[PDB]
Each structure stands twice: as C-alpha cells, then as structure tokens.
Symmetry: C2
Subunit: 187 residues, 2 copies
C-alpha cells in the first residue's frame, strides 16, 4: 500500500538545555501505534524505557535530558513505513559560553543585513546560531575561535533575538552554554 | 577541516498554494558560500535561472510557484576546497491541484483541555495519501479507500486550527485544494 513516512519533532524543541525536559513526537496520523524511534549510529537506551502506552501514541518523553540523550534520530511505524526525516537532538551547557556581537551594530535598517559574530574564549571547530531554528558554521578566517554569520533581510514585523553556541564536531550534538541574548533593533 | 551541513528552509513556508511566491533558503556560516540547491528524483531547471548574486547569499526565489516546482530539495556548499554534506531535505508542496476534502471533528471540535480528539479527512474521490496541517503537517493513509484518520495529542489552551489535503502517492508533493479551516475549541 502507501505507508507515508511519519513526522518527527521535539517539544518544546530540539535544542534543549541540559537537565531540562523534552518529548520526541512521531506521528503518522491516526490514533495509533507501531511507532519505532531509534538513534542513528548508536542505540539510544532510554527509548526501550518508554511505556508502550506512550509509544502507540508516538510520544517519547525525556523528563531530564543528559548528554547521553543527544543524537540524530529517526522513527517509523510498522509492513513498515520509511524512516521519518532526521531530528537532531541537542543538549546545551557543556562548555563555557561564547560571546555574540553584531558588527557594526544591533541596530539595522529594514530590509538590510547584519553580520553576527560568535567568539569563543577557547578554541572550537563548530559554532551554532539560533533565533528564539539554528544555523551551523565552521570557524571564520581571521578569529581565534570565532564564527561569523550573516542574517537578513531583517524587517520590523519580526522578532530578531539570537544566541550562539560553540561545539566540537567530535560530538556535534552537545553544545556549549548559550551566549547572552542578542536583540536586533530593526528600523 | 569541518564542513557543517547547511540549514535549508522556505519562506513563507513549504506548503504554498499554486500561483504564490516562495523563497527557499540554504544558509551556512559566512556572508557568501558556494551554495548549491538541487531537487531529488528530478532535476529542477528553475534553480539554474537563479542569478549568482542570490545564490552566493543562499537565496533561491520562485515568484509564482507551479506544479513543476514541487519536490524534495537539499543543498550544500563548497567545491569538489571542500563541499559540505547535503542539508536535511525540504519537501516543497504545492496545493490546489484537486478538489478539497472535508475535515470533521470525531465526535466534536469542542474538547476538554488535555484531551485528544480524532480528526477525519474525507474526499469525494479516491486518494491514497492525506495530510493534516496545523495552521506543520503529518501525512496519513486511508484504508481500502477515500478517508484519513488523525488523532491530535493533548489539546491545550496555551490555539488549534487545521486544514487537510488529499494527494496521490505518485506525486506526493502536489496536494489538492485545502479543506475549510477547522477550529478546535478547548474547554
């Protein structure tokens, strides 16, 4: 027949601060069941610890996330369906926090673009920029562990709040503590 | 080095009524990278008409979307000094190809907070695929014929509007006209 690849998502989201709650949702449609979540590359042990009741409903809750929970996940149901697109679960708070700046400034004209700079006091091969949806960048040419991002066009009609993270690619799903919140003043 | 897989999204979204504009974004680290957008299973000619000015900024606009625009896209950046993995896929859907299905509450649009309700998507003509969208979407199956059943998890006050669609699995990104909006009422 036609078993549509299910939809996988995290609530409240996929980038969650260590110690905090989150619930992985897999839902193909109807009231139920044969949902099967698994982490890519290394079996995730908490999944096996989810009450069949929640699994038929496609709810895989994590009361208190830990670095061990991080990873790329996919789920399916069942004949079976294709695996859902990957959901990368991220935990933050593992390394010192970088600093986020807007060059030249947070104040920018409507429809314009601004360069956001993420600087780390300790070297890293990976940086992330999220808007309270993240962007992933490698370091930038001239900087001692700094990634620079380009955001725009900005518009007043929208909220432009950012935070950036530094991480080691050896474990791409464990990010540093978030940077202070950076608010863009569109004009 | 380390080449972080780019983030690929669409503005204003991945479900666009036929005739409307839509801009697919593929972004990464710097101000300009050699981004490359491509569709799966069938090459997308429209991507080649994109000026290099936009491409370097990772922008790939579609002024007026058509059936031929629907599809599974991914992108990456660099050159064979280093190209990144392809971004997570983005399924670009185009709606309004078929007669709209009817969407109903099973037993009713007014439910107790924390409760679950069954949504039914019915079509006057056979379709092997259905989709339910919260004004994201989860796709379902019938299932000998014509209807789809979706179960929406713990309903909470902290807004619930839905529209459903019908489609052919042999053309999974071309959806029908949307059913009327269905507002759920929490008590």
């Amino acid at each position: 027949g036609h078993l549509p690849k299910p939809t996988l998502w995290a609530e409240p989201g996929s980038v969650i601060t260590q110690g905090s709650p989150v619930t992985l949702r897999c839902q193909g449609g109807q009231e139920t069941q044969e949902y099967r979540l698994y982490r890519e590359k290394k079996t995730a042990l908490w999944i096996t610890r989810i009450p069949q009741e929640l699994v038929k409903k496609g709810q895989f809750p994590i009361p208190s996330i830990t670095w061990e929970h991080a990873g790329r996940y996919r789920c399916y149901y069942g004949g079976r369906s294709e695996s859902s697109d990957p959901l990368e679960l991220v935990v933050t708070g593992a390394y010192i926090k970088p600093t986020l700046s807007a060059q030249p400034s947070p104040v920018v004209n409507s429809g314009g673009n601004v360069i956001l700079q993420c600087d780390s006091q300790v070297a890293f091969d990976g940086f992330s920029l999220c808007k309270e949806q993240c962007l992933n960048s490698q370091p930038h040419a001239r900087g001692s562990s700094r990634a620079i991002f380009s955001v725009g066009p900005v518009s007043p009609s929208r909220r432009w709040w950012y935070r950036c993270y530094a991480y080691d690619s050896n474990s791409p799903y464990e990010w540093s503590l978030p940077s202070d919140l950076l608010e863009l003043l569109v004009l």
